[PDB]
């Protein structure tokens, strides 16, 4: 996360972190329930083998509330393409259930129609993660969060050098130096409504980080709700 603030105690409890064999975080994820984690499909290619850490806010210190979980099943969307990053979505089934507590809790999955007309028409959403604090910087050791404005779909397409499919949406600022970044991918994009947070997106990609005239590109969760339910049912 470039800019923004660090997540305070209990503020981003649905945050999950995918870690490689050497215990390094490379992607984010969103806790959907005790057994399921939502992340990006392209993240599945960053590591041949990985696990999921929850309840983590500071990667270099322990506050016995963190927990590592092995992945039992990786459910990737069969239509994902590295060419355009379309269908950048995946669901992870954990071997053991997540025990909810302080800093560990699931985000809510909304209904499509309501989410699209009410949630995505709100002024802002919230993205978070352990990603780079600057485009060329290194990974953050502190979990961060950033309020990102929803970006008009037209302006989104006009600003991108890459095709923006119906499974993606823009969020962020035109020139202000705040945006998600490398490391935050697969992470949560949630929208607050009456103090309840709903999953509205998955950190997908961007042309650099916080670049002027460019926005953050997220997978449009509302387009995969039925798919997500299917994946969790099985």
């Amino acid at each position: 996360i470039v800019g923004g603030q660090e997540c305070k105690d209990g503020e981003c409890p649905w945050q999950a972190l995918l870690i490689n064999e050497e215990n390094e975080g490379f992607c984010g994820g969103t806790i959907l329930s005790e057994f399921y984690i939502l992340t990006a499909a392209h993240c599945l290619y960053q590591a041949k083998r990985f696990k999921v850490r929850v309840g983590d806010r500071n990667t270099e210190q322990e506050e016995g509330g963190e927990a590592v979980h092995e992945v039992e099943v990786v459910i990737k969307h069969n239509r994902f393409t590295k060419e355009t990053y379309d269908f950048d979505i995946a669901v992870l089934r954990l071997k053991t259930p997540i025990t909810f507590r302080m800093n560990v809790a699931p985000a809510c999955l909304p209904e499509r129609d309501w989410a699209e007309s009410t949630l995505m028409t709100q002024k802002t959403g919230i993205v978070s993660g352990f990603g780079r604090t600057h485009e060329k910087g290194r990974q953050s050791t502190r979990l961060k969060m950033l309020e990102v404005p929803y970006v008009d779909r037209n302006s989104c397409k006009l600003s991108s050098s890459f095709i923006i499919t119906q499974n993606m949406f823009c969020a962020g600022y035109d020139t202000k130096q705040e945006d998600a970044c490398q490391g935050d991918s697969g992470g949560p994009h949630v929208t607050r409504f009456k103090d309840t947070y709903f999953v509205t997106g998955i950190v997908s990609w961007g042309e650099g980080c916080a670049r002027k005239g460019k926005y953050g590109i997220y997978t449009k969760v509302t387009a995969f709700l039925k798919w997500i339910d299917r994946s969790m049912k099985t």
């Binding site: 209990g10 503020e11 981003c12 409890p13 649905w14 909810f100 507590r101 302080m102 800093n103 560990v104 809790a105 699931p106 985000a107 809510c108 999955l109 909304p110 209904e111 129609d113 309501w114 007309s117 009410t118 949630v190 409504f193 009456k194 103090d195 309840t196 947070y197 709903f198």
Partner: protein
């Protein structure tokens, strides 16, 4: 702004217009309250809530 377009139909969460008139519902882990608008947590750590303890 008439039904769900007017202040979310006074619903805490999901709002849908069925044969005119507002109908509220909630996410898994919540139950619609008696006023048929508010959503009450079924148990501890309901989804979408920042942990206060």
């Amino acid at each position: 702004r008439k039904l769900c377009s007017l202040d979310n139909g006074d619903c805490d969460q999901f709002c849908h217009e069925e044969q005119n008139s507002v109908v509220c519902s909630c996410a898994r882990g919540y139950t619609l309250a008696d006023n048929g608008k508010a959503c009450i947590p079924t148990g501890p750590y309901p989804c979408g809530k920042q942990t206060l303890e």
